[PDB]
Point group: C2
Chain length 205, copies 2
C-alpha cells in the first residue's frame, strides 16, 4: 500500500445532501472538479451558486422546474444517494473520488454516510470524505500516512484486529466504541498503522 498523502486529486466529486461545504478545501475541490455528481436536492444549491453539475442522482422531481429546463437530461435514477453516486461512477471506470457535503445535517444521515466509506473501498474504489474540519479515509490492513507534528488523528475501528502504530502520541488497541480511538496526535511527519481488517481514520486539518 502506497502512503496516504494530503495531495489528493480525485477524478470525480460527489456532492452529497448534507450541509453545503464552507471550508476552502472542499470548495476548491468542487470548483476545480473534472466531474461532479450531485445527490438529490444538493443540485439546487450547487446550481444557485452559479455552478454546473455533470450528473444528478434523484427521481426527476428533484430539481426546481426553473433549473429543469436546463439540466433534465443529466438526471438519473434502492440505497442512499451517496452510494448510488459511488456505484454510478464505478460503472464508468472512475476509481478515485472525493465526497463533499456528506455531513452537518441530520445526524443519522451523517452516521450512515460515514460508515459506507469502508464498504466502497472493499469494492475496489478509492474514496475520501472531505468535511469543513478534516478528511475521513477508509483503510484496510497496514497503511502509512503523511502528517505533521501535533496533527490530530482519530481512529474508528471497523472490525480490524491487532491495531498498533508508530508516529502517534497514544498507543493503539482493538477499539470498539467510537470515542476510544479519537483525539490521538501525530508526533512526527508520518505515522503507520498496522493491523488486519478495516478501519477509518479522520485527519483534522
Amino acid at each position: 500500500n502506497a502512503m496516504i498523502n494530503e495531495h489528493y486529486i480525485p477524478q470525480a466529486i460527489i456532492l452529497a445532501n448534507g450541509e453545503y461545504p464552507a471550508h476552502e478545501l472542499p470548495l476548491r475541490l468542487l470548483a476545480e472538479a473534472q466531474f461532479v455528481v450531485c445527490c438529490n436536492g444538493a443540485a439546487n444549491e450547487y446550481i444557485s451558486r452559479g455552478h454546473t453539475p455533470d450528473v444528478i442522482i434523484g427521481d426527476g422531481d428533484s430539481l426546481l422546474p426553473e433549473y429543469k429546463k436546463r439540466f433534465s437530461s443529466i438526471i438519473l435514477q434502492e440505497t442512499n444517494d451517496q452510494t448510488k453516486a459511488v456505484h454510478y461512477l464505478q460503472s464508468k471506470g472512475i476509481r478515485k473520488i472525493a465526497i463533499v457535503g456528506a455531513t452537518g445535517k441530520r445526524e443519522d444521515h451523517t452516521l450512515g454516510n460515514i460508515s459506507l466509506l469502508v464498504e466502497y473501498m472493499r469494492s475496489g474504489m478509492e474514496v475520501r470524505t472531505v468535511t469543513d474540519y478534516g478528511t475521513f479515509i477508509p483503510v484496510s490492513d497496514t497503511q502509512s500516512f503523511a502528517s505533521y507534528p501535533g496533527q490530530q488523528v482519530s481512529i474508528i475501528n471497523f472490525g480490524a484486529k491487532g491495531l498498533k502504530a508508530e508516529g502517534l502520541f497514544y498507543p493503539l488497541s482493538d477499539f470498539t466504541n467510537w470515542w476510544q480511538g479519537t483525539l490521538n496526535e501525530a508526533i512526527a511527519d508520518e505515522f503507520t498503522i498496522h493491523c488486519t481488517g478495516e478501519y477509518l481514520v479522520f485527519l483534522a486539518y
Copy 2:
C-alpha cells in the same frame, strides 16, 4: 416503562400527556450552539446548566448565566473567565473529554436525569465520540439524552418501548446487541454490523418496541 421519544419534547404532543421533558440538568457541549426550537426549549427552561469549555462563550454572550463551566478557563473570553472564575471546575487531570467530565460532575452531585445539547455539528470526530459516549453514561446509571437540531439520541439496553407517530424516522445503531427484533417499525431488524444498515427505519404507529440483549442507540428524527 415506555420512553416518550421525541413526543415529550414537542410543545404539542400526540401522546395525551400532561407534562413535557424537564431533565434535572442540561449540559451544553462544545459542538454547534443549538439552533432548533426543541433543544433551545430545554436550555431556556433549565435550572442547572453545565457548559463545556468554550461553549460558555456563546451562552454568556446571549445574556445567559452558566451554573458550572467544565474544563479549560483559557478557552473563555478573558472578561468571561474573570466574571465566572469561581465556577470553573477541572474535575479530573486524567479525563480529557469535557462532556464526560460534565456527566461525572452531575453524577457526583446525585443528579441522574440529564440532557446534552450542542454535542454535534463541528469536528466530526468530536460528533462521533460524543454520541458514542451515551452508551457509557447509561451503563454508569445515568438517564441521558442527546438532543440535536434534527432529533434525539437515546442509549438503550435490552427490550425497550418508545412512543412515536406514524411515519416518524427511526434509526438504530448497534453497540453489540444481539437478537434484534421489533414490533411497530416498517422494516424488520437484523443484528446490524455497520452503522447505515439500521438507519432510516420508520414507525408505523404511535408506539414501537425493540427487543434484544445488549446495548444500542436509537435516533428519533423530529
